[PDB]
Design an enzyme around this catalytic site. Sequence first.
Site, PDB file in Angstrom:
ATOM      1  N   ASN A 172      23.309  29.767  36.671  1.00  0.00           N
ATOM      2  CA  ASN A 172      22.571  28.700  37.324  1.00  0.00           C
ATOM      3  C   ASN A 172      23.421  28.115  38.453  1.00  0.00           C
ATOM      4  OD1 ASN A 172      20.052  27.140  37.240  1.00  0.00           O
ATOM      5  ND2 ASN A 172      20.257  27.390  35.011  1.00  0.00           N
ATOM      6  N   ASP A 230      25.371  41.806  35.603  1.00  0.00           N
ATOM      7  CA  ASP A 230      25.388  42.843  34.587  1.00  0.00           C
ATOM      8  C   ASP A 230      23.969  43.052  34.052  1.00  0.00           C
ATOM      9  OD1 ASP A 230      24.718  42.395  31.628  1.00  0.00           O
ATOM     10  OD2 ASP A 230      25.884  40.544  32.047  1.00  0.00           O
ATOM     11  N   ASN A 249      17.784  32.487  33.905  1.00  0.00           N
ATOM     12  CA  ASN A 249      17.642  31.202  34.565  1.00  0.00           C
ATOM     13  C   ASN A 249      18.432  31.215  35.877  1.00  0.00           C
ATOM     14  OD1 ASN A 249      16.350  29.302  32.346  1.00  0.00           O
ATOM     15  ND2 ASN A 249      17.933  30.566  31.359  1.00  0.00           N
TER      16      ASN A 249
END
Length: 191
Positions: free
Chosen positions: A70, A95, A116
Amino acid sequence: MAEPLLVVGLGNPGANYARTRHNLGFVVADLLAARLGAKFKAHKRSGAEVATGRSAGRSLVLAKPRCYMNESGRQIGPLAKFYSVAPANIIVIHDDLDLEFGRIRLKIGGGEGGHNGLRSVVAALGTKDFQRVRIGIGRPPGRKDPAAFVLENFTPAERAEVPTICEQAADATELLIEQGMEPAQNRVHAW
């Protein structure tokens, strides 16, 4: 016909969960960093890590906040709109499970595999067709638990794989700058 390139390594700070290669962006960035030797830093109106790099007949802005996920999505949001860079110049590394635990996955449009952070980057950046460089860390065996299996901790297996792929991808990258990716892909993206 002239434009720099920006790079962003999305990983995981601290540790614990980072062991699950949750720090690929920072792992690859550090690797390529330790290799380049570049002396990165931490600042910017955002307040994250970054460093400039000259090569491939063009500059490179490798940045990466803390939380990354985030922290990156947002970090770039303004940082992206701050530098007013292009999407084909920005490359976010992360990844992902593709096949085995020792592969890479570099693409342009293709990306955002549920996260997110990634979603925060798209919303933060607003999506501009930016580039992404996801790594292939294992593959989903089924619906049992993909994320769970992705957040393992092959510290060891990954330790050898980390340098294994990194080394392979590192070569592909170097070669890419040497001439093109065609060979790096057929050479590296061949394994």
